[PDB]
Amino acid sequence: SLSAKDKANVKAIWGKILPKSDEIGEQALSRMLVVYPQTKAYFSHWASVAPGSAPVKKHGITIMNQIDDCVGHMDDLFGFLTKLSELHATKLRVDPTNFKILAHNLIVVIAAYFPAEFTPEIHLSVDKFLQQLALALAEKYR
Amino acid sequence: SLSAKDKANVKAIWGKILPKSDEIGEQALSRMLVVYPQTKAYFSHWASVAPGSAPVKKHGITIMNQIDDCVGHMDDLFGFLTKLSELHATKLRVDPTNFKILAHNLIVVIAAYFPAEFTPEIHLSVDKFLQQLALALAEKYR
Amino acid sequence: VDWTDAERSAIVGLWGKISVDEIGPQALARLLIVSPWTQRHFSTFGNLSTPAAIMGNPAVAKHGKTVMHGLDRAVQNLDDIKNTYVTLSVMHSEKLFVDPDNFRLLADCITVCVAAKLGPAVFSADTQEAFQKFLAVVVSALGRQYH
Amino acid sequence: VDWTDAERSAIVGLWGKISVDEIGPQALARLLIVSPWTQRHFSTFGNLSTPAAIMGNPAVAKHGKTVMHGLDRAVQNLDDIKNTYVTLSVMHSEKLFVDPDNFRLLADCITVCVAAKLGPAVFSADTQEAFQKFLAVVVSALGRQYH
Ligand code: HEM
Ligand code: HEM
Ligand code: HEM
Ligand code: HEM
């Protein structure tokens, strides 16, 4: 569970992330696909899974918009994510172990874009946030 | 989170487990230690980590007694495990990734002892239960 | 991978006491129920509406046998498992689009079914240690050609 | 392991362009804060009670340097990493009792610190692919002698 300090840290770093949200989403998704190619199994219907390609940019925005929205729902991430959990479980049938893979790549991207701001304490809070987000996405499985 | 059907399935199989609880604990712990020797890092202070040895039998009881009690608290596993979570995190400093390893070995042992009863549906509910138990043990970390 | 003589002996000995034709169908049916996202790949296999339907499904069963006999050549040459699965690996990646994490989940179901079949004395901690090591090498080999 | 020429060049180039004496302390401090159970191994190293204390801790800094210099030999021979770490693996297991999952967590902190230092254009997706592969081989090698 997020403490008040964790929540404050997440909101603070998102102040930096927000103006670059589309680019950060593209970067994070691109890195997930290339660095962890196991994840490509879900995206073979796209015209490309290359970094910076049209489908990757488009879906990078979809992911990051959702994560941006979650920053405003940190008091009840599970309820906020119920319909999206159902979608990933029942419609898309995504093995939920992949959620932490995306989280890792987003962390790497945030570090790359905001090195001075992404201190170990901020990193800890962001990791706690993204782990809870992953669990919320896994909630309606099985 | 567990459905009523999951809870009923867990209680039903625990009716088989309880008369053999001590033996099942020692089998599950023995297999964790031997099959996943990464876990031995936490038990170097014992006289032995050999299957069926006195320290392994004693601690297998400790673990299973706790999991047995959890079956009676399926409506609030997180609350029930709050102090045990803080103990593993702060006193023992166990990397929480290990909790899933113990769960897997317990599942293997239940299958070995109750093959006819441990159907895939029962297995599914037990896995859901042990995954929640692991998350409850991880809840007070960081 | 470096096998100890004990591990080598235990893998060959264990494999020899199970019927791949029985365990395969049980493991695959178990996977589809315990990790149900895996059903993504078998919707053409007929009736999968219920656990009972999955358990009685003859197409699932035939395929479980194929999976298990796929492990035969790994047991046959424990020293060349990486190269044994090259073709199978690209097929599962590029043709079937199977998330390779599901190989791990299937292997865990195979372990459960073998333990249920043989019991805790025959499927001892040391036998499980060797079998787990074997399954991990196989699972790595199956994911090897994913790019 | 079967490195592509692109992977080899990416790893060697990356390693040559970072300051290991800078990155090591950063990564180890990051590990102790983000994965605090790792503090188990460093309680003789002074004050670790707060993030600031860990980040300003000189013993932690020196140790982070030796970790990174420990990776030099892997970079110097990408084709023999398993043998490079055999004795270090025995040591971390039998003398130090380090849970080898912490190797993975440290490697992830190294990635974070390298990304922060180099930025997203120099530490591109392909460079990260190669560096992740490198770290995975090292982590495997460090865990190999645990029994
Ligand atoms: C963990 C953070 C994640 C978030 C916030 C997220 C969010 C989303 C959202 C908002 C959608 C659009 C759903 C709709 O159609 O209304 C989506 C779709 C999708 N997601 Fe996720 N997702 C996450 C992780 C993942 C991961 C790790 C994978 C697989 C490796 C994945 C696989 C997919 C797929 C295949 C689609 C459909 C895209 C398409 O068909 O073009 N998701 N996700
Ligand atoms: C996931 C299910 C688990 C349960 C229900 C459980 C339960 C317990 C309980 C009840 C105790 C006694 C606490 C006390 O002193 O009051 C304990 C101790 C301990 N646990 Fe766990 N535990 C679990 C998993 C693990 C795992 C996976 C590890 C490490 C691989 C671990 C490491 C330890 C250690 C080292 C002790 C102290 C034992 C000693 O020093 O003799 N636990 N556990
Ligand atoms: C122990 C791991 C596995 C092994 C050894 C294995 C092996 C095989 C083999 C030998 C074939 C037949 C290849 C041929 O026709 O030439 C096959 C096909 C297939 N496997 Fe796998 N497999 C494994 C895991 C999985 C998993 C986890 C899934 C999905 C959840 C999967 C999905 C499939 C599918 C969909 C086919 C093609 C079925 C068809 O003909 O329609 N496999 N596999
Ligand atoms: C990238 C992975 C790692 C590498 C390459 C590495 C390498 C090394 C090396 C070269 C030494 C010096 C050995 C000697 O004095 O002969 C060492 C010592 C040590 N390592 Fe590691 N290590 C790694 C990860 C870890 C982790 C994750 C931990 C604990 C969380 C750890 C705990 C220790 C401890 C406690 C010592 C001895 C400390 C001392 O005596 O001052 N290592 N390591």
Tab-separated table of C-alpha atoms and ligand atoms in Angstrom, chain A residues 32 39 42-43 45-46 59 62-63 66-67 84 87-88 91-92 94 98-99 102 133 137, ligand 1:
chain	number	residue	atom	x	y	z
A	32	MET	CA	9.384	-3.558	-23.498
A	39	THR	CA	5.944	-9.552	-24.956
A	42	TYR	CA	0.463	-10.102	-27.947
A	43	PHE	CA	1.094	-7.586	-30.733
A	45	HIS	CA	-1.624	-8.070	-35.353
A	46	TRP	CA	0.093	-4.654	-35.562
A	59	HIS	CA	-0.418	2.304	-28.087
A	62	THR	CA	-2.980	4.543	-24.714
A	63	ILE	CA	-0.830	3.034	-21.953
A	66	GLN	CA	-4.122	5.302	-18.455
A	67	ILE	CA	-1.178	5.450	-16.066
A	84	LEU	CA	-9.401	-2.683	-17.638
A	87	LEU	CA	-10.427	-6.490	-20.584
A	88	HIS	CA	-6.868	-7.793	-20.193
A	91	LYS	CA	-10.741	-10.209	-23.974
A	92	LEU	CA	-6.960	-9.988	-24.491
A	94	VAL	CA	-2.607	-11.411	-21.320
A	98	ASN	CA	3.928	-9.163	-18.124
A	99	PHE	CA	2.627	-6.177	-16.159
A	102	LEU	CA	6.140	-2.811	-18.526
A	133	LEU	CA	-1.159	-0.790	-10.653
A	137	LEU	CA	-4.744	-5.060	-13.480
E	1	HEM	C1	0.851	-2.550	-16.844
E	1	HEM	C2	0.346	-1.424	-17.357
E	1	HEM	C3	-0.689	-1.459	-18.501
E	1	HEM	C4	-1.646	-0.543	-18.732
E	1	HEM	C5	-1.944	0.737	-17.904
E	1	HEM	C6	-2.376	-0.968	-19.900
E	1	HEM	C7	-3.436	-0.303	-20.463
E	1	HEM	C8	-4.094	-0.668	-21.606
E	1	HEM	C9	-5.216	0.043	-22.189
E	1	HEM	C10	-5.792	1.342	-21.588
E	1	HEM	C11	-5.607	-0.608	-23.291
E	1	HEM	C12	-6.776	-0.230	-24.242
E	1	HEM	C13	-7.976	-1.088	-23.846
E	1	HEM	C14	-9.189	-0.768	-24.686
E	1	HEM	O1	-9.261	-1.249	-25.842
E	1	HEM	O2	-10.079	-0.036	-24.192
E	1	HEM	C15	-4.736	-1.770	-23.423
E	1	HEM	C16	-4.783	-2.700	-24.427
E	1	HEM	C17	-3.932	-3.765	-24.624
E	1	HEM	N1	-2.982	-4.233	-23.722
E	1	HEM	FE1	-2.510	-3.269	-21.960
E	1	HEM	N2	-1.864	-2.164	-20.367
E	1	HEM	C18	-0.799	-2.485	-19.533
E	1	HEM	C19	0.014	-3.581	-19.669
E	1	HEM	C20	0.003	-4.467	-20.715
E	1	HEM	C21	1.014	-5.470	-20.968
E	1	HEM	C22	2.287	-5.661	-20.105
E	1	HEM	C23	0.623	-6.150	-22.062
E	1	HEM	C24	1.313	-7.317	-22.800
E	1	HEM	C25	2.623	-7.587	-22.708
E	1	HEM	C26	-0.636	-5.594	-22.507
E	1	HEM	C27	-1.334	-6.033	-23.608
E	1	HEM	C28	-2.325	-5.338	-24.251
E	1	HEM	C29	-2.843	-5.646	-25.559
E	1	HEM	C30	-2.417	-6.777	-26.520
E	1	HEM	C31	-3.907	-4.592	-25.807
E	1	HEM	C32	-4.762	-4.457	-27.074
E	1	HEM	C33	-3.988	-3.552	-28.031
E	1	HEM	C34	-4.384	-3.771	-29.475
E	1	HEM	O3	-5.058	-4.783	-29.787
E	1	HEM	O4	-4.008	-2.937	-30.326
E	1	HEM	N3	-0.994	-4.568	-21.657
E	1	HEM	N4	-3.835	-1.782	-22.372
